[PDB]
Amino acid sequence: TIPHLAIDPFSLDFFDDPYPDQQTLRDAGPVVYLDKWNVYGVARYAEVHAVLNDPTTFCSSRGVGLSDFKKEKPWRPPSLILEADPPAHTRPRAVLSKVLSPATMKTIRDGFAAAADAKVDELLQRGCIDAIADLAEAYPLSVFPDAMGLKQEGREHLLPYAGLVFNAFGPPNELRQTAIERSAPHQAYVNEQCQRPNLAPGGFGACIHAFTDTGEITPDEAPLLVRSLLSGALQETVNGIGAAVYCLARFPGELQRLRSDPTLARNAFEEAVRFESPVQTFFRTTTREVELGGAVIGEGEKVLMFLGSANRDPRRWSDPDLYDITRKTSGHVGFGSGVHMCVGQLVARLEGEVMLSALARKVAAIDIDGPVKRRFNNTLRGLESLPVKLTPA
Ligand code: HEM
Ligand SMILES: COc1ccc(C(=O)O)cc1
Ligand SMILES: [Cl-]
Ligand SMILES: [Mg+2]
Question: Cβ(279) to ligand 2 under 6 A?
């Protein structure tokens, strides 16, 4: 009844151009079976949204990568937030929501905006830059580690650790094997920075440790909650900013609109998140037999959700493959949906907004002027290198 496909969504050919295969996955049916990895797949907006919003049946505590924690040992101790279900999920989630709160955003916004303006001014002095290393990576590295309270030494481990985390959600392919082989120094750095003395006063990490006396989390849970912010924050934000820059270079008409109204910056970044979907996929594991898309799925089955595909499903979006900075983006699943929907989305949107604002006010043209190189990762979509010339306004 359900169609079986041989597409490997973790193959390098797929990462190089996923969009035809994503249409094949959507058009084969609401629920497919991926024979390569023995998992169910859902690639249409409707089923992805449904799975995300039914956490009791489609749980996260057996892992959100291919590996089922009831069958195999997790490669690192489970996240207390991403890899927990309600009710254990609820109070750690509340702590992170309060650490990354609207009030925190109000405290840090002016500094984040000044750093974005300064970065764009610096890049305009050079003219020809790499929009990944010099902009998409450099800007978040110039604000987020400081906002965390991390010391200067060792920050070169942050992006590699993130890459490892996201490769480890994938199947046991070469990308995953090599990531875990290289993991020791990055893991050692990250775990040590999670301890209370190593997080500067007033930053996100110190605030997590200060939140250990309310009955929501205990002191021994704070290191792993800091670890979450050192796992899934930087690389996907970098990839989203890089995708926004790529889109503004490839769609110059949209840079022209953004220049004419810099208040479009926040939505231009949200649209880049939908269009690129830096986090392409996550898994859930069924806890009981369930009907989904007319199919019956048994207990203990992995279900692969194609977030990027759901964000390009023509059943839900008009002209899904176009970058449109005035699109009504509400409802996209680039940050997930439901109880696990990105707790750090306010930070990501702040960083993306203020960078696109700086570009909107300061840059007249963004022209690709060298070979564009893609970075392969089992879960993240993003560029390795984006050579551009920036023309000042
Ligand atoms: C464009 C940038 C970002 C993207 C695309 C993104 C994507 C996502 C997605 C799709 C989820 C849902 C996971 C699931 O349903 O299993 C999520 C959760 C999460 N994100 Fe983000 N994220 C971004 C930035 C950030 C930032 C900046 C932070 C921290 C400051 C952060 C921290 C987290 C955490 C801790 C969770 C787990 C929430 C939970 O399980 O309740 N993310 N993110
Ligand atoms: C969305 O990606 C992630 C990855 C890791 C974590 C975590 O380690 O808690 C959270 C979100
Ligand atoms: Cl680890
Ligand atoms: Mg090797």
Answer: yes
CA distances from 6 to 25, 268, 292 (A): 10, 36, 21
Tokens (6 digits) for 60: 């996260």
278 CB under 6 A from ligand 1? Answer: yes
Helix or strand holding residue 140 (H, E): helix 138-148
Among residues 350, 81, 59, 69, which one has the least CA distance to residue 228?
81
Whether 333 contacts 320, CB under 8 Å: no
112 lines ligand 1 (CB under 6 A): no
Q: Is 91 in the pocket of ligand 1 (CB under 6 A)?
A: no
Task: Find the domain containing 127 and state its range.
Answer: 4-392
How many domains is the chain built from? 1
302-306 and 290-292 beta bridge pairing? unpaired
DSSP string, 219-242: GGGHHHHHHHHTTSSHHHHHHHHH
- Using DSSP, state whether 292 is helix, strand or coil: strand
As a three-state string, the secondary structure of 338-349 is CCCCCCCHHHHH
Q: Tell me the CATH number at 82.
A: 1.10.630.10
Query: Helices in 251-332 by DSSP H: which ranges?
Result: 252-260, 265-276, 307-310
Report the atom number in ligand 2 closest to the C-alpha of 336.
1
Pocket test of ligand 1: the residue of 342, 347, 349, 381 to mutate, having most ligand atoms within 8 Å of its CB, is 342
